[PDB]
Amino acid sequence: NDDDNTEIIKSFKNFILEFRLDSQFIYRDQLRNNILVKNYSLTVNMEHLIGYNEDIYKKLSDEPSDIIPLFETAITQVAKRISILSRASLPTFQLILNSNANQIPLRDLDSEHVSKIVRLSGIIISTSVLSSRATYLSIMCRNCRHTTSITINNFNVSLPRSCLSNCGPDPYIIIHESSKFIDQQFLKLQEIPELVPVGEMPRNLTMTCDRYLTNKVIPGTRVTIVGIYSIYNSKNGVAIRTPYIKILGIQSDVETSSIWNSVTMFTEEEEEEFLQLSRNPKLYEILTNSIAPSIFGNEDIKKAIVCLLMGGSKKILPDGMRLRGDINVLLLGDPGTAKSQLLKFVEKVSPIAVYTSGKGSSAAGLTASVQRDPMTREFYLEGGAMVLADGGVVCIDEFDKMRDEDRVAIHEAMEQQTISIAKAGITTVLNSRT
Amino acid sequence: MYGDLGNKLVLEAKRTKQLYARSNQDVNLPMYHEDIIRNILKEVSNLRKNTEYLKEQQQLGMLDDKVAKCQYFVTLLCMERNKRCLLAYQRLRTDILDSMAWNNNGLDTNNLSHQEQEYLKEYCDLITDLKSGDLVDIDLSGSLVPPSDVFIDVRVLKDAGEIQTEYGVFNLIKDSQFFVRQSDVERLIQQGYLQKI
Amino acid sequence: FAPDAVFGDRVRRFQEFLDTFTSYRDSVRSIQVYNSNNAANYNILPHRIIISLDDLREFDRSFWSGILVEPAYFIPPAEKALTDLADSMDDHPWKLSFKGSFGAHALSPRTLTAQHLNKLVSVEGIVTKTSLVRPKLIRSVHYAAKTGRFHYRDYTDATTTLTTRIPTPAIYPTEDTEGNKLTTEYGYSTFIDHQRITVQEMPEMAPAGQLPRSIDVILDDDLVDKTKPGDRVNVVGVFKSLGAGGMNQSNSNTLIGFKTLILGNTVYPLHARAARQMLTDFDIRNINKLSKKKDIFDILSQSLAPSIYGHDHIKKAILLMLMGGVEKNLENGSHLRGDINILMVGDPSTAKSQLLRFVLNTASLAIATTGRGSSGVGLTAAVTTDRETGERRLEAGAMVLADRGVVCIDEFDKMTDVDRVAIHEVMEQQTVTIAKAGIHTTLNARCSVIAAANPVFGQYDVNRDPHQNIALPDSLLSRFDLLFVVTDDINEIRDRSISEHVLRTHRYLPPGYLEGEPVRPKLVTIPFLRKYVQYAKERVIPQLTQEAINVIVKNYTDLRNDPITARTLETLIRLATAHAKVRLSKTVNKVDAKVAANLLRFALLGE
Amino acid sequence: GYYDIDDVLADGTEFPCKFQYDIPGLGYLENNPGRPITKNTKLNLPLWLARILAIVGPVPFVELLPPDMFSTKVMNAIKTDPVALDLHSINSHFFSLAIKWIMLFSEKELANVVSELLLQRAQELNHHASSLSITNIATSTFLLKLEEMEKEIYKKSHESYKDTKRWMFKK
Amino acid sequence: SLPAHLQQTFSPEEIQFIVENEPIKIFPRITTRQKIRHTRWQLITTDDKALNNMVAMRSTEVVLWIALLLKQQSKCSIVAPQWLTTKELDRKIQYEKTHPDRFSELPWNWLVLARILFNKAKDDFHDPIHELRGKIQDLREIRQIKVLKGLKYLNESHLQLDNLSLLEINELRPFITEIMDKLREIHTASLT
Ligand SMILES: Nc1ncnc2c1ncn2[C@@H]1O[C@H](COP(=O)(O)OP(=O)(O)NP(=O)(O)O)[C@@H](O)[C@H]1O
Ligand SMILES: Nc1ncnc2c1ncn2[C@@H]1O[C@H](COP(=O)(O)OP(=O)(O)NP(=O)(O)O)[C@@H](O)[C@H]1O
Ligand SMILES: [Mg+2]
Ligand SMILES: [Mg+2]
């Protein structure tokens, strides 16, 4: 078996070391450039893997859960060969996959896709904390102190049942000092709204990412995913098991504020395009034309909507006082004056936004709500529309039909940019920059 | 305080430096800050009036060997600082104008001061004086990318009709393409009529 | 490479370090002689040293980076060497603590990451969900009744040790090897106090639209109870994993991770923008120097909220409320409160919320609340099950967390009345009483409430009476010391003044930022003002005096014999006592009573 | 350079000064031309002025107090972790100002520490300058913590690498 | 008058121009040597004789820009220098792996000439060109590791870089000189 695994590993080593287009060894260069900035991963385009040697892609797509670890191993060996002098240490490199295969919509994924590489898209509705998973367990026997170690690959693992040569019935314990761990995050992906069938409730999948794919995306972002559609045996029918996606690649339509507040991401070409756009003399008129272009007239409202999107400048003073930077606009008036259509456009164009209707809202449902975590039996705080809109806009349509004590709950978050909760023994002032 | 307007002006200098340094083309340099400069020059005139007042009052003699020495030294240093800020701003915009001269005019005018406009004229006159004198066999205003290819394909990007060259013609038909000696068309690549390589 | 072979060299290098930086030897001996004196004199300092980590770097960078990056192999030899130093002093294991310059190891519960496991880290955050304190068994001793020997047994778990020693099942011996019956000897057996706290990320730091992360800290022996919930803290300790992480095959779940902790080595309380500020003799002398300026009360109150125009009488009342009068205890334990309770009710955009936010940033201990966002239970205290043990336990609410501090309440009239029914005991008795879940207790809530509200109508209606303008019951309004009514009443001169002030306020630029770059007549500074308030709260308890009483009774009778009630009198006494604290004076005097009456006259009459 | 704009800006930063004499008329430094400056007045002055008043006097007219950017706190932060440190938040021109301060008061300790800082940050800076696209968040964060001095060195270095890569792979 | 990016270094194109002035061995596919039994090259930067006396497949040495100008047409084939072969590049790789401190004595123009000839003379190599590209890549990667190790020892005093290429030097120049300059400025500032 390990002879064949060695041949697979050598085949991938050759793919990294030999693949070349227009005089550039793109994977050698990418691996080196990643090593210098100390991200130990490689992004592979499966078009290139198919083009190199379609037998390799056949092995990978037949059984990715066995072949992806071997590819990662190959990447480690090349990483050492191109960044450490041979005969004068690095972790196991994550493999990230880019693909243009035909997507399966989230609702169509089923038993025929188990253990296959799958491509899909949706909106991330939740992101859990960074749990820790072992890559390498240092192990020893509780009685005779036989010491060994278990390398782990996270594609579906256990300790051994009895000692590897009396030691008692269940003999092994972990040694955490010499064991190694990685970040693991859970995301919940909900299917695209315009792809939901007629009269159906929108379906969602739990899915996991690890190493450098953690914290890459945040709730509300629309994403496309490459991953192994796979199963886990929950503690809860008969012979029934929970589906999930082991993520191998994430590609958001755009990246915004995922784990960054002062950091940014812009290319030189788009920065220069924005710079020469900023210098245009008719810029305000062009932006006003861009707002809701199929809505006639309402020019001062469109001008105000540009101002609301842009916002002012937030300020913090030696007093300690904070001055509100964002802008609030109310459209009050007659029926069919395109107010709701304008709110729809603003929710569509803003980089961060939420749309709610006042009669569909709640005080908690808007600012933030207390929840009880069921198996912990303990209270925690979950964000409402103001939290999800933080750093952007909340479009409160149908505002006059909001119940008054729901309406009053907006006051602090609307002026002080904060939500002062005091409930169930929780006391916090969450930020809401909306 | 007397240094502040100089700091505002050289922060302006730094921002226009970054504006010019971010791109391959000559970015059109921003407006000449006449208002901040006039505020500085008026501030310098006030500092001069203070030196005049003090050098008058050294006839009246108040503690002058130290106190008048100190007041004079401080106001003198304020004037040195304001001179440095003014000259830093003007030297940067001079440098950018010299660059633009060699790049184009030696082969947006509202943004210059009149001294800068006539300076740019005189500097172009100087560049032309060099390439018109001795060393004339080299077009000193030419490019500084080495000649990699003697024959090039060039696609006609804008129409200009029939023009002669040293031993022939080009009819610059829109979206026609030539295969031609680079030295016979370089002027038109610089002038933006021809596209490739 | 095996750790034991290098333990001796590491020990002698830390011994050479301690010998070199002899301030640590002096500290060890100071602790020892203090404890010896207090043991004999019939309260005890712990066997713990804070080493400046900079000193250890400048001594030996290799050992320093060993403490940072491999503490499980470098702290035990350092603590052994320290214990040997303490042993070398004339006539128990000594522990270490660390301060300074952690660099990349300075983190928060968000950016603490699996790459940091088993390293020494410093985390900044806010404490929540402190467990009960429990004794943790570490050694048990047993008298073998027939054999006569004292047998013993050590114990281990993943929290007791920096390295993963084999576990011990917490079972007490009962029989000798020969089968002789054992008896456990408490008092010779050894237990450490153990406490588990959740440090939460500071909400100001959490990125856009994400909620605060949190991590669990373990504290042992003298570190226990060094913090309560709501404390902003910096914790230093070893970030660790523990448990099986589902690798034990009884757990079918493939995806769950390992539990992780910080094993704490020191705990620093914070209010940097320290919870208690240190005062140099220079600070003492400056504080006294300023107190003799004839109009110091005006200087300090003008120095409050310098970005708020006007509202002079409110800022004066706020200053006296930060410096509340002395609490009285009388016969049969009868009690008179010393807090000053303020209600700002008035028109919108009259800086009521901004004044609350200034107070929140200026008091030593302030808890923010808002009317809709506050439950009555979330305000007093809430019953929860402590998952560490399974017992019903109280979680302190805002009024209890602000004890010996202040509470800020914005949008106060927007509260539901079953919330305001829970306000009454705090105002009237400085306490809250619980009678539910089989828990029957009373908790201290001794704090100045300052609150902001609007009238029942959107703006104050001068055609109608205060009880008709103001939503709250008279049974609640009478409990506030000062009821302020403010209005945004239009006037060109005042509008010009406030406008040009607000434009100066909005034209501010903090240091070092470029023009237009986004952010990441004598008056005292806010740090100075915070120090002055701490000084006056700690070091002066003004005594009432007859010359002040004469002014007080004259003014009280005059105010009453023209809304006034019996409670107005001790409010005047409190305001006078607090103004005596502003003067740093051991006595209340006629000046204090005059200012107190002037300010309460403003509040009542709109003078 | 006299016209070196980043030097003109660096000279505009301010340092804590303690005056050594009672001098009439200089109160405009204290925002009132009609009053004296007094001995042991502690005041922040721009370095283009503070540099001179600390040498002319005899006792010089000004003593320069130790600025916070070279305090023991900052030096210890430097000496633990040079690459993680946010020098830009300490002072945007910290290296130019350190060079001026070392020259103004010959100080071997600070010269060594600033040399160590520069070298250890130059390694990381070269790593981010050498890595090229085929911006990375790990690079995008590090460039915030660079001084204007280091940002200039980074742009020049990274442009050199990018130009070389361009020439090698594009015909 | 000189662009900002050319102030204190060479562009990669200028490095190519410098390397293009080297002589190179070619097989002519034209005959210019006239028999005893018409235009001559008449150059002024380089020697005119070899071009005036070419005979087809009698190998001869000419300046590289002329060799490329001929190889742009079918009229020439450029003989690879001896170092640019699989066995020789493998020997240099083994030297690089064997001696961590030294750079192997590849000629100063090696990367530039490899780029030029792989693009303009892809059909003239005896070895399969994909292997030569692979081994040139191995060499640049290993030498870059050595460069990174070297930069840990920058000084206020001096540095030694025995066999580093012209292109590798030119790539590093606006970094090494700047950092050593600022270390000098820090050091000299401390002197009394
Ligand atoms: N100026 C306009 N230009 C184009 N379509 C318009 C315009 N005004 C109204 N409409 C159309 O009429 C409808 C407007 O609905 P809507 O956006 O709900 O208006 P509204 O102001 O929100 N009225 P209401 O929700 O009853 O208060 C849409 O179908 C629009 O296409
Ligand atoms: N006197 C003042 N000086 C400066 N700013 C002021 C003043 N009065 C109000 N403001 C500004 O008004 C804004 C709103 O202040 P805020 O404290 O929220 O008012 P408020 O009294 O709480 N109104 P409300 O919550 O609707 O009852 C802030 O940005 C203040 O800076
Ligand atoms: Mg509508
Ligand atoms: Mg308010």
Ligand SMILES: [Zn+2]
């Ligand atoms: Zn065993």
